Design a binder for this molecule. Sequence first.
Ligand SMILES: [Br-]
Ligand SMILES: [Br-]
Length: 152
Amino acid sequence: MKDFKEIEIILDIIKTTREIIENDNEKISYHRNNIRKSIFFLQEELLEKYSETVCKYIVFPLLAYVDEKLMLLREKSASNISWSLLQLEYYDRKDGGEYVFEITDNILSENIYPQICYQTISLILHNDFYGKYYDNIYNHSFLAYKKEIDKH
Ligand SMILES: [Br-]
Ligand SMILES: [Br-]
């Protein structure tokens, strides 16, 4: 039952996202608000156990996943979608499509990390996080990251 409560929160965010995705700017704003409440509890709970770096490794990719799906909806949507980046509000950077795979390199290189690090990456990747690979999901490194992460 390792970090079960954290996992549920990450699932919930994935849900609040995949739902925003299947709507006007007052709905979006309410769900974003929920997401931010869920992030607050996720951080508070992880930081009782884990260093700041480990907490970031688990929460940044989830934010980058949410940002990516929202930016894509905002690209493909009939209505005007407004979305300030979560990854930027929380972690002061906006290069998530690259930095997630930098995180993934790190957790894959050293066998020091809690299992939730790998599960969080596995989840966003099973939910079609592409990041820097958006233009071509046939990329061999992209497929290797998936294979290697699930092997954990
Ligand atoms: Br949520
Ligand atoms: Br590339």
